[PDB]
Each structure stands twice: as C-alpha cells, then as structure tokens.
C-alpha cells in the first residue's frame, strides 16, 4: 500500500505552470530513530548527507533514473527536537532546467536549509572503475580509523552508532590524500536500505572519511562541517559497498576553508556506485572578515577590577625587611614610618623590621657595603618591601634623567636582593600614583619617573619567579590601614592599585574595540557636517550622529544645508535592519530633504546660492550638509514654506504620480486607498477630492477609522481583515472600484486586485510583496486589468528628469492650494530613536518630519572607522624608517600615496636601504630622508621644521625607533639601560614637545609585549616601554591625539613554525599593517597587539601569573549529568538567571578561548556562525530552551541573551 | 540593458522569461489570453525594477 | 489507520498564499477493482 520515501515522505504532483513537485514529510527523531546520532554538542542534527540523498531522490522522481544534480548547497543546520515537518519542493522553472529547495516553515518563518539544481545532464556513458589491487597496494600503511572517529566525536560532533561503517583506515601518510578506509552499513541500518538511494548514514560516513583524510593529527580547537557539493551522480544501488575513493584536492594548511573533495563510492569489484565532485567543508567568511577576526584575537590591555581582600589576616610573624629608597624629598618619612608603625601594631606576633635607607645615588660604598649591613647576616628575612614615596605631579623636560636614575637604582637593588643563596623573600613594592588604573580616579598626573619601574618588575617576576614580585600602587586618598593589611597577609596578587579607599587589581584583559572607543570629535552643525546612521541595524537604540566631512560640490552638484527631512517606510525598513538589499549598497537613512543651497556646482545653472530647494536623493538626507546631484533638486516656489514642502514631497510625489500620471484618474472614477491615514494615503485622499472621485478608503484600528470619517471621507472599512472587499462590493452594486492605491501586503493584495471592475488599474507601492516573490494568481486580470509598480526612490535614481518634473508639478500645485499637504508632527532629529518607533507601531498619523538641528549646538560627534588616516595635503614623519619595520611602513605609506613623508633615523642608510628609498621615490612617493639622534632636542626641532617648512603641514607621526637586545637580570649593565632608555623616553618626549603645536591627527608610539607580558629575554627594554606607555596615557589625558602599541613575536607556534610554516622574516608584517591602520583610528591610548590566545609562552604566564585571566578552561567535556543545570530551577528563577549569566559566559569562554565580559557582544570577538552553532547547541543542552539564530543576533550581548533566556524560561515556570 | 516594451503573445515559460527581460520602466503589454485564462501564477518579483503589466483584449474592450 | 487515503493519494499542505491543500490522488478499476462493478450506462464510471 504505502510506498512513500522515508525522508521526503509524500510526493504530490502539481500541474500548474511552472510545473512543481512538492514533497512533504516528517523528519523527526521519533519516526526515524537512527537519525538520533549526529548529536552536534549533544543535540540531534540532520546531516548534510541527508540533504544529498533527498536531492538525489527528488532528481530520480522528477527525471526518472540516471538523472543527477549539480551545485548543491547547505545553508542552515537543524535541531530535530521530536517532530520536524519538512517541505522539500522542486520547480520546473524552464524546460531542461529545474530548481530544488528544502525548507522548514515551522514557528512562522521559513529557512532555506539547502538549495539545489536537478538538471539531468547525463548520458548513457557508464563511469570507469578503479583497480582494487592498485589502490589497496598504493597506500596500505594503516591508521587507527576508529580512534580517529572517536577523537573527532570528542571534538564536538558525535556520530553515535547508526553513523558507523567508517572502518579503520590506511594512508600513505597522515597528511596525504590517501586514506583507505572501509564502509559498511551498521546492523541496525542494513534493513531498510531498499527505499533509499544509498543510505544517508552511508553517505555521511563516506563524507566523514574527509575528517581523517584532511589531517590525522588534527589540531585542538578546530572544528569543521561539510558544506555543499559542486555535483553529484548516483549510478547503482548500494546494497553492498566497500570503500569510497579518497580523491582530495584540498588547498589546506590554513586550518579551515575547504578541501574540495571528490568522493567516489565503489564496491568490492571496483565499480563505482555514486560520484560526488567538489565537496567543501567549513567555508567561513571572506578574507576581510578573516583579518577582522585576527585583530580581535590579539588586542590586549591592562584591565583593572575592584575586589575585597580575602586575606582578612593569617600567617602572623610578619618580620619583614624594608628599604626607604630614593627618598630625596624633604619629608618622605610619613609613608615609611606609618607603614612600619602599622606593621608593628596590627602585625600579629613578632614583626621586627629594619630600614635600609638607600637614597638615590647615596654614595659609592652603598652599592655593596651599605647593603651588607643587613643583607649579610640576616639577608632575606621573611619578606621585603620597597617604598618609593611621592613625587611631583607633572614632568619637566629634564625629569627624564631622574627616571633613568630610578631605573638604575631599581636594577642594582633588585640584582643585589636576588643574590641570596637561601629562599628569596617575596618582593613587595609600593609606588605612588605611578600606574594608570581606570576612569575612576585616573588620567593626568602620573609620576613618569617611577612609571618605567613597572616593566622592570614585571620582567623580574618571570626571570626569578621564586621571589614573588607583587607590586602595589598607592594613592594619597587611600589611607595606610588597608595598605598595611595587604603588606601583612597579602594574598597571591601581583599588581594592584590602592587608587582610593578601595582595592583595585589588574587582569590582562583581551579587549577588542567597540563603540565607546571610536574617536570623538567636536562639531558645530552651523557649518560642520554630520550624519545619522544606525550603528547596529536591528536595535534602533544605537542611532548616533557621525561626522560627514562635507565635500565641496562638483560638476552637476549642489551643497544644501538641510532644514528638515521626513521619515519614510524605506527609512523604517533600513532602521530595523530589514531592508531588501539588492545592490550591495546599504541605503542611507532618509529619502527627502528641504533646505537652502549653500554652494553651487560647476556645470549647473538652474539655481544659485542662497535659494531654497527641495527634492530627494540617495546617500542619506539626515545630514546637516547634503551634497546631491543638481539635476535631482527642484526650486521651491515662493508659496510653499519648508514644512509644506517636506510634508508634500514623497507623499504627493507618490500619490500624484500613481493616481494621475499612471492611472489617469478622472471624474466619477471609483478609487480605493489603503491605509488612508498614512501620509501617502492622505495625499491620495487630497488628490481624489481635487480630481472629483468617489473616495473609498480603509484604515487600521477603529480610532483611525473614526478620525478619517471625521474628515468627511465616507465608506471606511477595516484593513486588517480581508472583509473590506465584500463590504465595498455591497456598497457599489458590483462595480467595485476603478483604481486601487494598495499599500498593504498579504491576502489584502488579492482581494484588492479582484475588486476592480472591468476598468482596471492597480497602482502598487508596497514593498513587502514584490521583494518576496508573492506569486499572485493571474486569473483576475482577464477583465482588462493593469498592474503598476511605483518605487519612487528607484525611479529617482534611474530617471532623474521625470521625477524632477513631477516634483516641480506637485510643488506648484501645492502652492496654488489645489492640493493640501498632509498632517505633520515634528521631532528633533537627535530624537529619531523614538520617532522610528511611532512609524512602525503606527500610533501617529501623518508624515513624521524630522527637524535637523542647524544651530550653534556645539556637540560631540563620533568618527567611525572611516577616519582621517591618509590625507593628501599633509606631511608625515616616520622615525627609524631606514631599518626594520621602518622600511615596511614607509613602503605602505607610499602605497597609500601620502603627501611628502619625512623619514629619519640615527645613522646613514645602508646600500639596501638607499636602493629601497630610491625605488620608492621612483614609485611616485616624494619621501625625503634625514638623520640624527632623536634623543637630542635639536634633532627633533630640525625634523619638525623640515616637514613643516616644506609647505605641506605635518599631521601624522610614527615614532618606531628601537633596537632588539637580550639580557638577563644579573648581567644587565648601565650602558644597556641608557641605550634602551634614550631612544624611547628622550626621543618620544622631544617629538611630543616639538610637534605639540602642529595640527596632528595621530601619534603612534611603538612598544614591546614584554612590558605588558614580561619576557626573561630582556629587562632593559621593558622599563623604557612601560615608561612610554604611561607617557602615552598622560599625553592622551592632555587631550592631544595619541596611540601606543605594544608589538610581540611573529609565530604562535614557537620554533615549530620553521617546520610547519617555513622561515619568514619580521613580525607578521602584513598582518600587523592592517592592525596598525585600524588602531590609529580608534581612541584607546594603550593596546597590546600580540599573538596570544594560543602560543608557547602562554603556558608559562598562566602558571606564573596569578591574574592570567585568559586561562585555559579545558572543561568542555560535558556529559549526561550536565542537565542538572536545568534542575537548579529549584532556586529562585531570578537568581537562576543571575547564575545563567555566569553559565553563559563560561560556556562562551571555551569556544572563544578567552574570558569575555558580560556587557560586550559575542560578535565583537569573532564567531564564524560556527562558534554560534556551538553556543546555541550548548545553551539548548544545558537549559532545555532554544533560541533561533535570528533572535540571538539582536541579543548579541551576554546580558541581553541571559535576560531573554530568563524570560523564555520564566514563561515555562508559569506554565 | 534589456528591452523596454514587450508585446508578448506566448505562453508558459516564454512569458515568464520575457517579464524578467525588460529593463526599468519596461511595459509588459500582454495580448495572449491563453496563459491568463489558465490562472497562471506569475512570479511577481521582476516588478522590482518598476515594471508595469498590462492586459489588452480588443473584444472585451469594445 | 493508514496515512494515505485511497481516493485522494497523499495529503500535502502547501504553505503558499493562500494556503492550499493539494492531494493528487489516483483511481482506477485496474488497482481499485471495487469501482468496476458500478458500470454506469454499461460503461466503467465513477460512482
């Protein structure tokens, strides 16, 4: 009786053209038990092999046997909760070509899981076989295929039992396309193989072969998933099969992307059963997104947090040692004396301590003899603390020397301290406002001289980990009580700041850019140009002004100062991130505009400056200054005020067109207007009254209907339901209507279309139906209908002259008073956030006019990634250009064509440098070289003058001079300290002073990751780099532009890069070029771009660093018990959501490989909709509630998604 | 660029192909009652470009 | 009991505008012999 296919289910034939085969059925687990086994992160999912088999069955049905499919695609995954209706449909679009698409229409929306083409395109040409005795003997070297499957399952996507068959394999090597596995249907799958054209389980295993084929030694943290195949063909039933050919053509070694496999299924005899060509796994995103991700997973910063002291008190017997060092101040006693007194009093038990008051450059014998007074017989007694005391709040030009002396003092004293045979004491260090913490009491007034210390102490903490190197920053208004408490029983914390009456601790935080660090600028609407544009299409709460750098008009252009624009349904659609993009150019907000001409183009003569103007344009009209094509603007006749003109445009310009120049409305012609109360509807009402027609209409809620009836227009009916057609039919005796200015979608469309009576005109202005392939029934057209479509914006862009004439006509008519402008309700343009809300919910009637603020309203606008980077008419100076990264950055600047970049270094260039310079000059860059030591003020003055006196103002700088050197604590010499100190400190300070007056746009100061991380390789470099870090913070505090970068190493794999990646030079130059070009635009002062999130030394930092917030978090091995998280609903559900926050962040951390905050967005760090797959599946498994890949996007922030889950679970709790 | 005026008289996939062909503002004039009286389901969407569909039948008009 | 209906073939809900139920059944004395006896007008006919 029943013979339906199991996956597809029913097959029903439609005779309507284009001929369509519609397949419907259930693919739930309850029906097909075996389906349950592709638990991706422990949740059932339909394998792509299922899509392949289903497409093959559809092709066989439509074209009989020996017909195959091409260019398959997979688009979304599935969930298969219990039951899952599936609606596979195939259409005969044109003879000889067909299309096949599978989608699920549950929950009220569709999801095109896979698209296909089933053109037969096959002939009676049997495929050739393969030689068993050859392929088997070629690659017999065995490999643990079953263990490979087990590890691949552990990787996150399990296979269960039904998807077995893939047998222990053999290959020439791990990394070659030679895997020789064997495939057989598991016992539970052998039975029903007849119905299928090759079991989806067998095809899935055949695919799965690619998992072992790619790389047997797969790297941890990588996930792959098949995505589409270029072609397919099924030759014979797979009642029996042995192996699938392992022909792979992967362009691998990038970790992901594809593999372009061509699997061929063949039996024991060598004959082939099914052929697949062009198989790709895990495509990911475009190259631009790859570079964007590479920036997320590297930017670092010093994150500070507030906490309480868990020490409370313990251990006792705090007989530490103290040294009052470099305290040349008149009265630096209080800090040391108070600390000693608190230690004596509050310190439990005996707390004897002594002071080795080694002042700055006290006396020669103090180097050793002065220290041995206590560091000889009782050295390293139970703990030591260094106190540095206060200092002046601002730096003098000569203050640099003092910092050098301080670093010399620290290196000497610490080398002496570390030279103790017995176990070393923990090295406390208290410094006064030498570390910049956070917006809470942080900014200017940082003690620069002490600032360089941080890097040295941090490198020490790695060089000699035995002496725990905790260092504490302190503030005037913190009081010494909790400071003494930290001294006494301080827990294992490395770097902390007592910035106020509160404890602050540091955690190296992976902090990608966002929306709070975009460069802010001060603009004036009166003459400065700024635009409005949604930052995050979808949540209109993010509307924010943006600088627009008004460009002077060109030929055929005008420069109009907007006075008021109007919302329009296109604006609403774009605001909610729902516009039907069609030309890879997202439309800007606003369509119309009314303002005054401020400048005149070259080739234009229609109008002059100082004259009013109106019209619409693309490029966004929600601006203070707008530059639109001159041909697309109409002078305002004297009658119209600005308000009337803005209200009329796009209301009459639509209504007048549709009803007059297309439908040719005449006296006594029945008209039907949908959504009359809207602006377009109101214009239509006015037009109909003017031309003398019977004005039917329909509205929304009853209040609007009553209001419209108050206007005198009789025959008002509800628009929500289709009932209006019948009612109007009753009230007209059959002659329903002659014109329909439809603007609603859905069933109403058909009713309106059928309403017309033998005259025919259907002007359609809606947008939902047309961009949806609404596929209307064409039968009602038999009675002389005529269907129009009227998209005013598109007409304006393509046929400016016609819309220009139309606009002139409507304005002239409005001035004469024959037409009345609709009702208006102004809003301040800065308040667009709520205004858009009214339009969508339709509580306000009439056109919403936005009144752009054109006044002296001084404000802060935000410059997006489109920021001033390479401006032609300015000079750029690069220091140390003649060596290392300088050459590469100089070449990059030349490529950008920057104007007359100045290049300098400390010495004459080498012959290769001269060759590169002359070549770049020949390339067209007007680069000029200089020389001299940057540590000299004269050199800086000469450099700044040369770049300025040349005639091109200097605005960009890049101080990159540095030389890499290696040293260890003991052998660190003073000359090394000086030669590291001068290039960074003195050069940078001189550059800042000399350039202080110029109109700079950035200031890039290079640094090393050592100052941030701490590498035993070098310690002298760390001090100078930390100093330049703090100096950059201070400069930003002063308000001048600045940006400090801490570079790192080249490879993320260590020395294995030579074998696995090959010898390469520099520090990932191309990778860092984009990072620099981006980071120079944003505002954050300090940032560390270093290859972390997986790297050799990270294994060491996590151990030696008590902060180490990056962690490893190797606890992803969830199990069946993990469900208890749902069972924790016994506790209060609000508190349950509070803990759900932590669940979410922890689960996200493993996939992201780093701890993220709960306030930012997941998309910021970068997830290829595969990190999204993991997150969604894990959320469902750990909570039993599902969130669609759509609703996750809007709630991209951890807080948002947590609140959404809390609500969607409290609803269940209520049930 | 495509065509502008299409005085179609074919049926089946021919008219569907024609409707996609014409450029912006093209006016797809129709005279062949065959497809229309069969309640063909026109793939309304090529109207994206501001097309206009007419049906012309001399006898009924008269 | 049996999902298919003898006089209608296979039920299918098409989620189009408007929603349609399309069945595409088959009938015939060749397979549904019980129709043969109702030979209306001395010719095979649909009851």
Author numbering:
A (entry chain A): 892 to 2106
B (entry chain B): 1626 to 1687
C (entry chain B): 892 to 938
What did the article's authors report about this structure?
As exemplified by isoniazid, which targets the enoylreductase in mycolic acid biosynthesis, mycocerosic acid synthase (MAS) offers a potential drug target by producing part of phthiocerol dimycocerosate (PDIM), a key component of the cell envelope. MAS, a fully reducing iterative type I polyketide synthase (PKS), is composed of six domains that together catalyze the elongation of n-C6-C20 fatty acids to prepare mycocerosic acid. Using a combination of dual covalent crosslinking and cryo-EM analyses, we elucidate the structure of mycocerosic acid synthase from Mycobacterium tuberculosis trapped in two distinct catalytic states during its iterative cycle. These structures reveal domain architecture of the acyl carrier protein mediating condensation and dehydration through dual site-selective crosslinking of the acyl carrier protein with the ketosynthase and dehydratase domains.
We also obtained a map of the modifying compartment DH-ΨKR-ER-KR-ACP (3.74 Å) from the same dataset. Complex C demonstrated the modifying compartment (DH-ΨKR-ER-KR), with ACP crosslinked with DH through 1. In this complex, 1 covalently crosslinks the ACP to the active site His929 of the DH. In contrast to the extensive interactions between the highly negatively charged AcpP (helices 2 and 3) and a positively charged patch of FabA, the ACP in MAS shows only limited interactions with the DH domain between Thr2072 of helix 2 of ACP and Asn933 of DH. Arg2045, Thr2046, and Tyr2056 (ACP loop 1) interact with Ser1187 and Glu2000 of inter-domain linkers (L2 and L5). Unlike the shunt product in complex B, there is no probe observed in the uncrosslinked DH of the opposite protomer, indicating that the reactivity between crosslinker 1 and DH is facilitated by ACP binding. Unlike the narrow and well-defined FabA active site, MAS-DH features a deep binding tunnel to accommodate the long, branched-chain acyl intermediates. Surprisingly, while the E. coli type II DH regulates the substrate specificity via gating residues, we observe a major domain rotation of the crosslinked DH in comparison to the apo-DHs in MAS complex A and MAS-like PKS modifying compartment. In the DH apo form the active site entrance resides underneath the ΨKR • KR domains, providing no access for ACP binding. In complex C, the DH translates and rotates away from the ΨKR • KR to enable access to the ACP.
